[PDB]
Design a protein around this ligand. Structure first.
Ligand code: HEM
Length: 154
């Protein structure tokens, strides 16, 4: 798939808002993911023990990881489709070390959309959401293809 320049502009305009508070958005997105799909929390030996949202919010480790995740995703989005170099190491660790099925990447995509919808209604109308969805679908399609090449495609 290929996004138009207009679609990338919608994606990067809302991402610029997210970047005003990377740590806050990161906490919201990961907590939304762990609450909506508790099975995903099982993949994190570091966070598996967290029992409630209050505990998740108070974890400094979880917040730091959210910043690491959003910074990586942000670098990918900014390449506007030419993200092959960035995807390689991410695909390798998530397929071989962490063992993260494409289904889970769908769950976090849903979490990202929910959080942007709640915090940025003015910059995340229908057209903007469609563009963000398309960007994340592209991300998932390319990651899936790399998974296959790496021998996982899980
Ligand atoms: C937009 C989606 C994602 C991005 C950009 C992303 C990014 C990252 C980054 C940059 C790290 C650091 C280095 C590495 O190990 O590769 C990481 C680690 C990890 N990721 Fe992701 N990830 C994504 C989705 C997921 C999902 C959906 C799961 C699980 C449900 C997952 C599980 C993990 C685990 C288990 C680790 C290591 C945690 C630790 O250091 O203890 N990732 N991810």
């Amino acid at each position: 798939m290929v996004l138009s320049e207009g679609e990338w502009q919608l994606v990067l305009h809302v991402w610029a808002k997210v970047e005003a508070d990377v740590a806050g958005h990161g906490q919201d997105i990961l907590i939304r993911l762990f609450k909506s799909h508790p099975e995903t929390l099982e993949k994190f030996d570091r966070f598996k023990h967290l029992k409630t949202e209050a505990e998740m919010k108070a974890s400094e480790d979880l917040k730091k990881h959210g910043v690491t995740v959003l910074t990586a995703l942000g670098a990918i989005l900014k390449k506007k489709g030419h993200h092959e170099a960035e995807l390689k190491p991410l695909a390798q660790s998530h397929a071989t070390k962490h063992k993260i099925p494409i289904k889970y990447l769908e769950f976090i995509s849903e979490a990202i959309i929910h959080v942007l919808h709640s915090r940025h209604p003015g910059n995340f109308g229908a057209d903007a959401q469609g563009a963000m969805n398309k960007a994340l679908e592209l991300f998932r399609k390319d990651i899936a293809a790399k998974y296959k090449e790496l021998g996982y495609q899980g």
